[PDB]
């Protein structure tokens, strides 16, 4: 199942991301159920917004919210929910939501999948529009849902992203 | 796998539905294979019709046709085949087909997924057009397939739907 | 999982094909990972081309490239990645790529799924345009990827396709 | 505008069809307004059905219902509403609806657009499934609309189709 | 052309709306050019948002921003840009943007197109979620565009909507 | 109509492009008919290829093939056939086809539509993958059509593109 996919070939540089939500999709918030490996509908989002990138997680990690760490993956074409993409972390958007600190990593397709993102080595190489769109999305996507909310704290670099990967990988290792 | 998803958090009021066919999709009749949990193509439907709602089943139930009980789930946006949605039963369309009585439950997204359907408490709260579309779909979707056919028997309420859930859950329990 | 799906009800005449890529889709080359059964992104294809048919494989087979044997399945509407379709082999396009001989079977939906393809009994019954499109696709889809390439060797009949099925089924049987 | 498009290069053998509704589309019944040439929504159809082919009309014709003659055009991929396709008539489905006799021509893409349909010379060469789907569609698409209804009278050949073209062209000529 | 479409059969009760942007579409802000009647790209919107309803205007009106009055039209399925739908006004969202007061009417499909919206007689009958989504959309869709901004002032009823229609119709009449 | 759209606000720097074919679309080759301004189907393309960018023309120009000059426009999301986008030329792919020299301009969305392409000032700033995809597309898209063919001659800069615009604008001016 999706439950059995590694965190990565060589974390934190070389990771796999399980996709839950495609870029530019209908506002259905899918989440993989850890017990079954199945894709569940968490909610029908209430704002008229879409994820700027594919959205998913790194398996065999545990963030402080109790779920695997959250990752955005830009691609040339939207990915299928439940698919897995090999990627390389390049930055992280720090934020707190209704449950606490819950960072949003950005990882680009690995060179072996495409050469398109090889020039993106660190967070400053991400397009400014994309970064602003991501920040705006997380600032506002919960605006019409009672008891959900976000404080966006700012962009940090690839080293920071990799530290978060390692930390949440080690957290799951000793659960 | 999808094989391991509960029938519900608290049946029959609070159920999970495994989706096989999205609303308003191409006429591919997918079915989950009970042995593998994989999505198989049962047939390419022959009429130029689409399911008015997402279509799927409640796991760990057994109807008289030998399959898990059939459920229609209206949503704001079509769901992915193989995904699972938490729902609440609100009515049932009774019918017989070429194999016998094989009712079609209607269950709406659970309040925790959306508030949109909370006002739908019983079958009379479903839109009349939607109910008529569902009835017409099942009356006609087999019209061009030899040895497939339907007799639609009528709409019944949420209590009737819940009774069917319990009955087919208990049937699977002792198989 | 998809790992547990038979090669066929009655190979080589009656087979199942696990779909990885839909017909006429975005240029994402998905592949099922044999370890996990999950759909991985192999690459983002570099040419502006699409598969003329759904593309996938027969489980529990092993071709000389180390993967299960490759199958194209024409359908009236594109199939979902990760779904399984019952089919009947009708021809094969022989070719060598950067790793060696790696034939592309064509199998049509089984009569039980549709009557649409029953008249296609052998390779000469496939539409000429479709065959030419398939040949052209494999001749060119790697043209912009370094270290990937193809030599198309020609169309052969249904008996040849069935021989390839049996051979790669027997190869996996003794791995 | 679309108002100024010829009926055909060489009617009735060589015609243009203005497309109003794509094949396999959402149930929005678009119609070109004769005054403005704009695409208007006639209605949101009430049954869960789709047109088996693109649907439109031959400009500068007048059928007995007061509109230009109705044409179905099968294509490999759905056409855009408001686009124009060169075609060749091959058959006609005779029927009466709530307003009277209102035949449905079938015309295939002209050889200059594609070779795919050149083998379809007359109504017997159309696929049987497609013809049955068209007949079933018109028999049922008005089933949930009060004061709309259909009596399907049967398939006739290409000569009959061409006669209808000429007759409605001549009708518009002297309005 | 679209330039020649009436404001309505019987304004302000019975209007036509020219659609520029479909509901739930990609973030391309199309606008009809008054000179040519063609659909121009005004901009590629910068936030990750979509219009909750189809969006367009009433022809032969002039609002204070210099364009025809703006209308949102909910439908069961998204409409084609450049198409025209007969509708009935039911409410208005008052707001000011970077150019001044520029209200957003809501008009539902006319009864002759569908019975689905007949129960919506006034603004209080619109779903609360939809109204909140519309308000949130206009509050935020310009958030990442320099020199574009919005102050949302509040919902008013069908009479207010009709007054705005009449006022901008009369404004265009004497330009 | 589309017939009445200017070549540009300030040619050759500031142009309008009428879109005929969206990026990444089905293989329907639409063309605007100069007489009617309507979108006609020229052909159903025979290779399994798609245009890497939106494709269209500059109105009120005449190239040596007798049609207005051909332009590719990259956008974040595909454009609607028949829509018009303001753009800025940045390069040109020179080639000859079955009718003669028939260059393919590349023009990016004008700064007023988006800031995304402002950094693309000349042909060397276009992504290498995109340029290679465009070249490969034109080298191969006619490979399965008798009496259609292409010789790609190479990329030239923005000044060359602008010269071609001016030349074909002046050609149409004196027809
Ligand atoms: Ca989308
Ligand atoms: Ca998450
Ligand atoms: Ca969270
Ligand atoms: Ca999280
Ligand atoms: Ca659909
Ligand atoms: Ca079932
Ligand atoms: Ca049944
Ligand atoms: Ca059943
Ligand atoms: Ca496609
Ligand atoms: Ca393979
Ligand atoms: Ca290979
Ligand atoms: Ca292979
Ligand atoms: Ca469709
Ligand atoms: Ca008609
Ligand atoms: Ca009629
Ligand atoms: Ca008619
Ligand atoms: Ca959309
Ligand atoms: Ca406007
Ligand atoms: Ca405004
Ligand atoms: Ca306005
Ligand atoms: Ca596409
Ligand atoms: Ca051209
Ligand atoms: Ca040419
Ligand atoms: Ca040309
Ligand atoms: Cl791991
Ligand atoms: Cl993306
Ligand atoms: Cl990498
Ligand atoms: Cl259970
Ligand atoms: Cl639904
Ligand atoms: Cl509930
Ligand atoms: Cl097996
Ligand atoms: Cl196919
Ligand atoms: Cl068979
Ligand atoms: Cl004419
Ligand atoms: Cl069609
Ligand atoms: Cl012809
Ligand atoms: Cl008027
Ligand atoms: Cl809508
Ligand atoms: Cl009304
Ligand atoms: Cl001009
Ligand atoms: Cl593009
Ligand atoms: Cl510019
Ligand atoms: Na909130
Ligand atoms: Na039947
Ligand atoms: Na290569
Ligand atoms: Na009726
Ligand atoms: Na702003
Ligand atoms: Na050729």
UniProtKB/Swiss-Prot annotation, chains A, B, C, D, E, F:
InterPro entries tied to this protein: Pyrophosphatase, Pyrophosphatase_sf
Principal EC category: hydrolase
Gene3D superfamilies recorded: Inorganic pyrophosphatase
Locations listed in the record: Cytoplasm
BP terms from Gene Ontology: phosphate-containing compound metabolic process
Entry binding sites for Mg(2+) 1: 65, 70, 102
Origin superkingdom: Bacteria
Gene Ontology terms, MF aspect: inorganic diphosphate phosphatase activity; inorganic triphosphate phosphatase activity; magnesium ion binding; zinc ion binding
GO cellular component: cytosol; membrane
PANTHER family: INORGANIC PYROPHOSPHATASE
Function: Catalyzes the hydrolysis of inorganic pyrophosphate (PPi) forming two phosphate ions.
Name of the protein this chain belongs to: Inorganic pyrophosphatase
Organism: Escherichia coli (strain K12)
């Amino acid at each position: 199942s999706l439950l059995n996919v590694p965190a990565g070939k060589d974390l934190p540089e070389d990771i796999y991301v399980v996709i839950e939500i495609p870029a530019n999709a209908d506002p259905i918030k899918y989440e993989i159920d850890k017990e079954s490996g199945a894709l569940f509908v968490d909610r029908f989002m209430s704002t008229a917004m879409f994820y700027p990138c594919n959205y998913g997680y790194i398996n065999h990690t545990l963030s402080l919210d109790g779920d695997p760490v959250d990752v955005l993956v830009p691609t040339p074409y939207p990915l299928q929910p439940g698919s897995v993409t090999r990627c390389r972390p390049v930055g992280v958007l720090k934020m707190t939501d209704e449950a606490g600190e819950d960072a949003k990593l950005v990882a680009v397709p690995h060179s072996k999948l495409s050469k398109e993102y090889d020039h993106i080595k660190d967070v400053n190489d991400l397009p400014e529009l994309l970064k602003a769109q991501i920040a705006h999305f997380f600032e506002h996507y919960k605006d019409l849902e009672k008891g959900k909310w976000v404080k966006v704290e700012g962009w940090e670099n690839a080293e920071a992203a990799k530290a978060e990967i390692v930390a949440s990988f080690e957290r799951a290792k000793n659960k």
